[PDB]
Amino acid sequence: NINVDVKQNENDIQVNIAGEIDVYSAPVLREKLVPLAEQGADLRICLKDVSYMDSTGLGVFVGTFKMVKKQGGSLKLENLSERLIRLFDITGLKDIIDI
Amino acid sequence: NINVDVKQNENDIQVNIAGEIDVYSAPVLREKLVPLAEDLRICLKDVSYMDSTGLGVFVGTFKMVKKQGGSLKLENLSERLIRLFDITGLKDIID
Amino acid sequence: NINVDVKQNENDIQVNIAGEIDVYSAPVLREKLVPLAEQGADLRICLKDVSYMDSTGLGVFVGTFKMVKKQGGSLKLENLSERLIRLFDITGLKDIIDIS
Amino acid sequence: NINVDVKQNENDIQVNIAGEIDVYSAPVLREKLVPLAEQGADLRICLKDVSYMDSTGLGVFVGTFKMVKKQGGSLKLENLSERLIRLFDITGLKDIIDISA
Amino acid sequence: DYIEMKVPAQPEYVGIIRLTLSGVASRMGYTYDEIEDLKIAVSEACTNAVQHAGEVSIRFGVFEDRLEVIVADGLGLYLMETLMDEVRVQNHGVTVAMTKYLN
Amino acid sequence: DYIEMKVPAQPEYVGIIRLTLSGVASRMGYTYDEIEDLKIAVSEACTNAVQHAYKEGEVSIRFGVFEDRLEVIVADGLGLYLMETLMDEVRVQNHGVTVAMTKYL
Amino acid sequence: DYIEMKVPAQPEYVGIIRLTLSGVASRMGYTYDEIEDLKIAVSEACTNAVQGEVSIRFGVFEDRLEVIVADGLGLYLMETLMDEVRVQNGVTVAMTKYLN
Amino acid sequence: DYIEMKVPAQPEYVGIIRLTLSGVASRMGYTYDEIEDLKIAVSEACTNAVQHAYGEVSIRFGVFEDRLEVIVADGLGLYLMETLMDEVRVQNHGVTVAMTKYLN
């Protein structure tokens, strides 16, 4: 599964993601963090405890980047394993998304 | 240090806790679970450690649940963890 | 797989087992542990880091208890996780094989 | 805190080492491998399950390398972690001792 | 819902059977203690199968209330029977069917 | 030697495949990085199958374990990209789709 | 025999302490079940201690592990899980556990 | 903020330090590769301490806002330390090893 821990203080909100983000769990992640993109406040997502991630995980991440930009917010990811950064780089997402 | 995942559906809340419940994290757990108390299902399958402070926030929120009429269930508890609930004699009270 | 670490001190042999004792690896344990048993040593086997065991491990162990008694030694099992003593009990095998 | 599993058939020896190799554990490792090196046999030592290694392990390994070369045998280290191969590289021992994954 | 595996009749692959079983059982809600008990039992069925022949077929039926495992081509039977909620055997090769109701 | 699995075209069962593959991967002897890449590729093929059979399923996966290479076959745009770059050889054919990839030791 | 540690009197470090304890206890042979029980007890002592700096002394003897913490809901837990507990009054906690 | 430890200068007890260090570095936020590097470096310092003692060894971890400072007191390893860490200094009279690795 997956464990998504959202903490919102003074619109400086930090998500901690732990577990596997696959086709099964990426909808759950999107459902949890889309209301966070709507207020579009500065959010930081910690993938320290992500054990696996796939293109479906990248998909929810790009969907949230666009939605955060539309409402005037920010998106930071940190910190990612050297292997997770490679996963983002190969997809040509390392340049667009913050890390 | 600690991870608390809340899903709210059908005026029914499912919390999954993974990580350590010690003196450091129990205030965080109390602050997260108090807006829910003041029907809960809490999953401890992935709790790796707990001491008297975790049970303390649990007793506080159990009191909050009885006072506000809701529910409180604890489930997928590790046999060693459920045995801990026996030694403190709480299996009879809080599942 | 499985890792078998034999240390022999004071004419007393201590085996440490780590891993899985199943249908695959139990022949390895028989080969390792039977020449030690059929020479009447006093054996101490540590299952501290055994992660899994089923009846094939129990079979290899009772066979080595047999050879230990036939050639005049002892057999002790030590540092067993809660589950392993439970298997030795439910199998009605704790009755005879040592445990600690 | 270390498991050294020697399987020897017909002058070809396979050691599987699992756990930590430091100053406390390295003596144990040398005691296990030195009679085997002094056999002139062919050692194949599997480092798949090593959780940690520092110079003390490197020392017992270079000593085992010399002992095997001295007695007319072979030495190969196999299934090494990316990080352990980096450790053997940093010290320039990748050059001296055969190594693979 | 039904998951099906087919492996060579070899001891090496019994671990794989256990690994998939641990996965299937984890999604369902089985406790850690229950899932280890499941591995011992399913692993005993498969052990008898390898020592029977070959290929070994395993079918997981994942239901609402129960997990039903069926493996096909004296110490161990007690373990299956004691650890599972219902164990059944048939001949002519061998087929072991076992269910554990998750409670 | 061949391993065969059949799972409902459901997202939950995608995890099962990675898990089994992981065992099959480690036993044959790939790096940590290789086994992690293998999980990405096989899981993407299975995602594609589930998302296809979505409209109308069952998914078959077969691991072929050879001396030098592991051959994965899954049958019923970013993901195919990952499959193609993370594997040594990828083939696709219709028909739904049957995706074949091999990764060498 | 004499192990000493000093942590800021803050909650964060109980994990660190638990970690070192798990280490000392692991070298003993204390089975995993025991080492988990020991973490419960020592963490209870340290938690009451913080509630500045905290001093922890592990005395590792032949058969006995001694934990000493220096600068109410829990105390039951300590006494039940451990073999001998004492107190002094500033507060100081004493803990000892036998071998199985 | 600082952590202080005192251990018998015996080989057995080096792992204990490794565990504490590993915990601290994980809590602070170092990469896996970095935390493994710290284990190598601090274990090398302690190894030299035990060997050049026989005794007892003192260690102080200073967790600073943005760097870890390791201080060990009572030769492939010295290369290893100097290599894996960002700054190492040594002084003797008995020896004290100080090494720091930056958090990023």
Swiss-Prot record, chain C:
Phosphorylated by RsbW on a serine residue. Dephosphorylated by RsbP or RsbU. Keywords: Phosphoprotein. Gene3D superfamilies: STAS domain. The keyword tRNA processing does not apply. The modification Phosphoserine is found at residues 51, 55. InterPro entries: Anti-sigma_ant (IPR003658), STAS_dom (IPR002645), STAS_dom_sf (IPR036513). NCBIfam families: ant_ant_sig. The gene is rsbV. Residues 2-100 form the STAS domain. Monomer. In stressed cells, forms a complex with RsbW. The predominant form of this complex has a stoichiometry of 2:2 (one dimer of RsbW is bound by two monomers of RsbV). Binds to RsbW in the presence of low levels of ATP or under conditions of energy or environmental stress (through dephosphorylation by RsbP or RsbU). GO terms for molecular function: anti-sigma factor antagonist activity. Transmembrane segments: none annotated. Belongs to the anti-sigma-factor antagonist family. CDD domains: STAS_anti-anti-sigma_factors. The modification Phosphothreonine is found at residue 56. Changing residue 55 to D: No interaction with RsbW. The keyword Phosphoprotein applies. This is Anti-sigma-B factor antagonist. Positive regulator of sigma-B activity. Non-phosphorylated RsbV binds to RsbW, preventing its association with sigma-B. When phosphorylated, releases RsbW, which is then free to complex with and inactivate sigma-B.
Swiss-Prot record, chain F:
It comes from the Bacteria. The keyword GTP-binding does not apply. Pfam families: HATPase_c_2. Keywords: ATP-binding, Kinase, Nucleotide-binding, Serine/threonine-protein kinase, Stress response, Transferase. The higher affinity of RsbW for RsbV than for sigma-B, rather than a difference in the concentrations of RsbV and sigma-B, is the driving force that is responsible for the switch of RsbW to non-phosphorylated RsbV. The kinase activity of RsbW is directly regulated by changes in the ATP/ADP ratio. Its EC number is 2.7.11.1. It is an enzyme of class 2 (transferase). It catalyses: L-seryl-[protein] + ATP = O-phospho-L-seryl-[protein] + ADP + H(+); L-threonyl-[protein] + ATP = O-phospho-L-threonyl-[protein] + ADP + H(+). GO terms for molecular function: ATP binding; protein serine kinase activity; protein serine/threonine kinase activity; sigma factor antagonist activity. The keyword Transport does not apply. GO terms for biological process: negative regulation of DNA-templated transcription. Negative regulator of sigma-B activity. Phosphorylates and inactivates its specific antagonist protein, RsbV. Upon phosphorylation of RsbV, RsbW is released and binds to sigma-B, thereby blocking its ability to form an RNA polymerase holoenzyme (E-sigma-B). HAMAP family: Anti_sigma_B. Homodimer. In stressed cells, forms a complex with RsbV. The predominant form of this complex has a stoichiometry of 2:2 (one dimer of RsbW is bound by two monomers of RsbV). In unstressed cells, forms a 2:1 complex with sigma-B.
UniProtKB/Swiss-Prot annotation, chain G:
One of its GO terms (biological process) is negative regulation of DNA-templated transcription. It comes from the Bacteria. The higher affinity of RsbW for RsbV than for sigma-B, rather than a difference in the concentrations of RsbV and sigma-B, is the driving force that is responsible for the switch of RsbW to non-phosphorylated RsbV. The kinase activity of RsbW is directly regulated by changes in the ATP/ADP ratio. Its EC number is 2.7.11.1. Induction: By heat shock, salt stress, oxidative stress, glucose limitation and oxygen limitation. Keywords: ATP-binding, Kinase, Nucleotide-binding, Serine/threonine-protein kinase, Stress response, Transferase. The keyword Kinase applies. Changing residue 9 to S: In strain: IS58. It catalyses: L-seryl-[protein] + ATP = O-phospho-L-seryl-[protein] + ADP + H(+); L-threonyl-[protein] + ATP = O-phospho-L-threonyl-[protein] + ADP + H(+). Pfam families: HATPase_c_2. It is an enzyme of class 2 (transferase). One of its GO terms (molecular function) is ATP binding. Negative regulator of sigma-B activity. Phosphorylates and inactivates its specific antagonist protein, RsbV. Upon phosphorylation of RsbV, RsbW is released and binds to sigma-B, thereby blocking its ability to form an RNA polymerase holoenzyme (E-sigma-B). Homodimer. In stressed cells, forms a complex with RsbV. The predominant form of this complex has a stoichiometry of 2:2 (one dimer of RsbW is bound by two monomers of RsbV). In unstressed cells, forms a 2:1 complex with sigma-B. The gene is rsbW.
UniProtKB/Swiss-Prot annotation, chain H:
It comes from Bacillus subtilis (strain 168). It is an enzyme of class 2 (transferase). This is Serine-protein kinase RsbW. Homodimer. In stressed cells, forms a complex with RsbV. The predominant form of this complex has a stoichiometry of 2:2 (one dimer of RsbW is bound by two monomers of RsbV). In unstressed cells, forms a 2:1 complex with sigma-B. One of its GO terms (biological process) is negative regulation of DNA-templated transcription. InterPro entries: Anti-sigma-factor_SerPK, HATPase_C_sf, RsbW. Induction: By heat shock, salt stress, oxidative stress, glucose limitation and oxygen limitation. One of its GO terms (molecular function) is protein serine/threonine kinase activity. Negative regulator of sigma-B activity. Phosphorylates and inactivates its specific antagonist protein, RsbV. Upon phosphorylation of RsbV, RsbW is released and binds to sigma-B, thereby blocking its ability to form an RNA polymerase holoenzyme (E-sigma-B). The higher affinity of RsbW for RsbV than for sigma-B, rather than a difference in the concentrations of RsbV and sigma-B, is the driving force that is responsible for the switch of RsbW to non-phosphorylated RsbV. The kinase activity of RsbW is directly regulated by changes in the ATP/ADP ratio. CDD domains: HATPase_RsbW-like (cd16936). PANTHER family: ANTI-SIGMA-F FACTOR RSBW-RELATED, SERINE-PROTEIN KINASE RSBW. The keyword Nucleotide-binding applies.
